[PDB]
């Protein structure tokens, strides 16, 4: 009473309560319920951050201003604090003493209305443990008789599990559906809140910046709902303008200042959200060629799909891109993916399809249903995309995957969303999908049996038609056919590996001078046609890292460097040179 | 009308409370919704609207402006989706019969198994049917329910097992949006 | 030097608390070590003895002489245990390659697959190696982790919803001890 209940009309006269914008439809339903003879206790049901308490608090603002109907005039909204009231009891009858006193005040004033924020708390354990004298039971007969009016607020999750268990209490409280507002509604809402936030931070928010906050936040921040989300990014921008400026800097909050704060919220490097990253995308094709040279047709294809996705031409609900890297091993089919993530500055996700070969393995990706082991785990695929909405997804050896796994990917390409065991929608339309398979390579290299060789140009594509179902292939944006490495391309790969070893040791102070003869020998032994260039890292480790590492700790190689590798023609072995 | 309509449409509440809720709420609407030119009496039309708001679907407003929407529903769908006119006729006629009052009263508005090749309009007519009617789309991808144990996700786990409080996705979704289009894509995969 | 050996040998607290503690501990010890004499200056060998007490490890191992022990690793194992001389010598050369700093640092330092008849001291070299290097010993028998459900225990307990402090069996041991040998037995039957 004295401190448990805080009046909202008196507060509204001073301020504090923000004004309501674009909620006449929801308000009209509440007023209709409040005017009822009995069970005049509306309940605002809505997701988190959807203005659940902005309508109750704003109702008081309307009453003071006078927008409410005449019947609702002269009514006072009371905001009950269950924590404060319940705190300090330390007795069996202290709660009922203060609680009944509160009802006595409301019962005396027929026009008084009560607002109980987070009403789900009382149903679980209001004021009793190991007993049955709860707070809800005390108000059950009063609400049934219409003596007092109570306004409640609880989320859908706390409404189906906690609420509705005691049908008696649910009967008295009517339910008003609250829906997340559209983008056009929120931008108008922020305009009304601009004077309060601007005066608080002593800054100005440009109209263009407000529209960019709701748009960028929705794409890069999916966990929180749009209304509270837009307020956080807008309010956070003003805080930066208070500390970063040294003195008399620009008060206006431009679009560039919003892109930085929203980037930190999403844990991104600010390159994607920023509009000044076009330079990276313009030269993305050339940059990848230096990192992963060869098969330029494969690299340019990715840049074209990525450019349109970031140019406003991306699909409305499909992913940024779905590709099937059908090619041999050792042609950097996976290297192009890991390097692409570094260019775009996004997380990399790798899944081994070989593990998902049995029929029951698909459950691990989407989680186990309720009532079975693994239900607590959300799912490897669903938790990864949800944790990192902007990330690259790699699925290697997709051909070995069970058909049950292929079915999961069908919805991913067409709708861009995958549901999990808990019902969370995995909205990952921003992640690029890349798959690697070696299905058709066998027919390309292998000639047709018989004295006469048939045309095998289309035989490789035919194999993909039988392995992959038509619906799966239709959803793919494009198929990137890699080509075998040429004699000159392989020689450059040897230089790439040596550069990593050379630069790794150059900082330590050990110079490396590999002879051309050694580079050629490593290429043949390191690159197998069947296994690709994967053994290059292995042979390089045993041939170079093993001997140099031993002498690094003890011997002359610890300092001075002057290492010169060579190859002898008599035995074809690689000689080693060490000096101080 | 309030007693009969409440039983037919309002659910999860008993008849005395249900009938008295429509009668009480109807008094506040007629008394407070019109600022002027108020209606002293409460006719059957008002009770239907109140029941419709509680249950989310109307029963006598079909000959209102919504009447024109049903006429252009078939033509509008044809513009967005070309060909396969026989499928649009089935959906538009089923809705008309249900809205007109010729429904089964014990079965859904319609149950149609659209079968055909890939990319011919199976998952487009349904997506474009909700937008035209302005109702929520309950999209369910059956590719996830590959095993028999996945049925628990639809109707929740039984008592005494993990995930019991979570509930069913299909049941909770329909309860939240009773008026909606239920789409079970790739039902054969389940 | 204090910060490098503190975080590695103590393996109890975090890096910032260790440095402030050892510095304060070192000053107190040297301040009252002799009855009359005193040493205003400090040395690395002096503070090393202090870390031995809180770490419960001999001062010789606590000393920053990893290269010395690594150089005579074979001589130490051959002197402490007898037999399998050829097997022990091969292991020392490989470990030296990882500690040199070459290769990718993110990759694990230890890639060794022991394969031989039991009872010849195969287990003894794993504990002797850890005792010499100072790292802890974590034994995880694969035979217990045979059932498919048991595999999940390594990542997390099945019913441990309230108990998130323990976490996965393998993960918690590695998290608490970042410098310790992992001994997997009967890995073939998994």
């Amino acid at each position: 009473t004295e401190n448990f209940t805080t009046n909202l009309n008196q507060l509204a006269r001073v301020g504090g309560i923000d004004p309501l914008i674009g909620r006449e439809k929801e308000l009209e339903r509440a007023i209709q319920v409040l005017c009822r003879r009995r069970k005049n206790n509306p309940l605002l049901v809505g997701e988190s951050g959807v203005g659940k308490t902005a309508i109750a608090e704003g109702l008081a603002w309307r009453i003071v201003q006078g927008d409410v109907p005449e019947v609702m005039a002269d009514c006072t909204i009371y905001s009950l604090d269950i924590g404060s009231l319940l705190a300090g009891t330390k007795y069996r009858g202290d709660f009922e003493k203060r609680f009944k006193a509160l009802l006595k005040q409301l019962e005396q004033d027929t026009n008084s209305i009560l607002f109980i924020d987070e009403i789900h708390t009382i149903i679980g354990a209001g004021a009793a443990s190991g007993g049955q004298v709860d707070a809800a039971n005390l108000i059950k007969p009063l609400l049934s008789s219409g003596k007092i009016r109570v306004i409640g607020s609880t989320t859908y999750q706390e409404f189906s599990n906690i609420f509705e268990k005691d049908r008696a209490l649910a009967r008295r409280f009517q339910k008003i559906d609250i829906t997340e507002p559209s983008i056009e509604e929120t931008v108008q809402i922020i305009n009304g809140l601009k004077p309060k936030y601007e005066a608080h931070h002593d800054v100005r928010y440009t109209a263009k910046a407000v529209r960019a906050a709701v748009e960028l936040a929705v794409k890069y921040i999916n966990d929180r709902h749009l209304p509270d989300k837009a307020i956080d990014v807008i309010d956070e921008a003003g805080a930066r303008a208070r500390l970063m400026p040294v003195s008399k800097r620009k008060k206006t909050v431009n679009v560039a200042d919003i892109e930085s704060v929203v980037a930190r919220i999403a844990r991104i490097p600010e390159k994607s959200v920023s509009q000044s990253d076009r330079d990276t995308l313009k030269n993305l094709g050339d940059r990848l060629k230096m990192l992963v040279f060869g098969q330029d047709k494969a690299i340019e294809a990715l840049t074209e799909a990525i450019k349109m996705a970031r140019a406003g031409l991306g699909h409305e609900h499909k992913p940024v891109g779905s590709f099937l890297f059908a090619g041999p091993t050792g042609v950097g089919k996976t290297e192009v993916t890991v390097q692409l993530s570094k260019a775009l500055g996004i997380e990399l996700l790798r899944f081994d399809m070989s593990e998902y070969m049995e029929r029951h393995t698909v459950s691990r990706l989407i989680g186990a249903p309720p009532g079975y082991v693994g239900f607590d785990q959300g799912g490897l695929l669903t938790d990864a995309v949800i944790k990192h909405p902007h990330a690259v997804l790699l699925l290697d050896e997709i051909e070995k995957a069970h058909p049950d796994v292929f079915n999961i990917l069908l919805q991913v390409m067409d709708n861009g969303t995958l549901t999990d065991n808990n019902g969370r929608k995995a909205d990952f339309r921003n992640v690029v999908l890349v798959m690697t398979t070696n299905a058709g390579v066998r027919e390309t290299e292998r000639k047709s049996i018989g004295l006469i060789h048939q045309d095998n140009s289309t035989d490789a594509m035919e194999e993909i038609k039988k392995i992959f179902t038509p619906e799966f292939r239709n959803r793919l944006d494009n198929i990137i056919w890699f080509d075998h490495l040429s004699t000159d391309v392989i020689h450059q790969v040897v230089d790439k590996f040596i550069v990593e070893l050379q630069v790794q040791l150059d900082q330590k102070g050990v110079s490396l001078e590999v002879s051309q003869e050694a580079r050629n020998w490593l290429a043949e032994k390191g690159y197998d046609r069947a296994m690709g260039a994967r053994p290059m890292a292995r042979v390089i480790q045993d041939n170079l890292k093993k001997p140099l590492a031993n002498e690094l700790l003890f011997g002359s190689l610890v300092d001075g460097g002057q290492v010169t590798v060579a190859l002898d023609k008599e035995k074809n072995e690689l000689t080693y040179g060490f000096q101080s | 009308a309030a007693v009969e309509l409440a039983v037919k449409y309002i659910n999860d509440r008993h008849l005395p409370d249900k009938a008295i809720d429509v009668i009480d709420e109807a008094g506040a609407r007629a008394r407070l919704m019109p600022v002027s030119k108020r209606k002293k009496t409460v006719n059957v039309a008002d009770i239907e609207s109140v029941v419709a708001r509680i249950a989310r679907i109307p029963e006598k407003s079909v000959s209102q402006s919504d009447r024109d929407t049903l006429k252009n529903l078939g033509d509008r769908l044809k513009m967005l989706v070309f060909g396969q006119d026989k499928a649009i006729e089935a959906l538009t006629e089923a809705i008309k019969m249900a809205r007109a009052g010729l429904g089964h009263e014990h079965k859904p508005v319609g149950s149609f198994l659209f079968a055909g090749p890939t990319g011919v309009g199976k998952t487009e007519v349904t997506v474009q049917l909700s937008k035209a009617l302005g109702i929520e789309l309950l999209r369910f991808d059956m590719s996830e329910y590959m095993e028999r144990h996945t049925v628990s996700r639809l109707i929740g786990a039984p008592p005494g097992y993990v995930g019991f409080d979570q509930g069913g996705l299909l049941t909770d979704a329909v309860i939240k949006h009773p008026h909606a289009v239920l789409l079970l894509d790739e039902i054969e995969k389940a | 030097a204090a910060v490098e050996l503190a975080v590695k040998y103590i393996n109890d607290r975090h890096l910032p608390d260790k440095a402030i503690d050892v510095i304060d501990e070192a000053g107190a010890r040297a301040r009252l070590m002799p009855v009359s004499k005193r040493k205003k200056t400090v040395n690395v060998a002096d503070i090393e003895s202090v870390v031995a007490r809180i770490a419960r490890i001999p001062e010789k191992s606590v000393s920053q002489s990893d290269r010395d022990t690594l150089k005579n690793l074979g001589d130490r194992l051959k002197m402490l245990v007898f037999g399998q001389d050829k097997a022990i010598e091969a292991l020392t050369e490989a470990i030296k390659m990882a500690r040199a700093g070459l290769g990718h640092e993110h990759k694990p330092v230890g890639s060794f697959l022991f394969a031989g008849p039991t009872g010849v001291g195969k287990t003894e070299v794993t504990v002797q190696l850890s005792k010499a290097l100072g790292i802890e010993l974590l034994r995880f028998d694969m035979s217990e982790y045979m059932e498919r459900h048991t595999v999940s225990r390594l990542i997390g307990a099945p019913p441990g919803y309230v108990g998130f402090d323990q976490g996965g069996l393998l993960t918690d041991a590695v998290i608490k001890h970042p410098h310790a040998v992992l001994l997997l037995d009967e890995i073939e039957k998994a």
Partner: peptide
């Protein structure tokens, strides 16, 4: 089919204590 998993429910315990009074005189 994979085996099912059962989850237990633990009830918290909290009680109210009375208070005796002693008059000074």
């Amino acid at each position: 089919g994979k085996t099912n998993d059962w989850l237990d429910f633990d009830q918290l315990a909290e009680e109210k204590v009375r208070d005796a009074l002693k008059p000074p005189s």
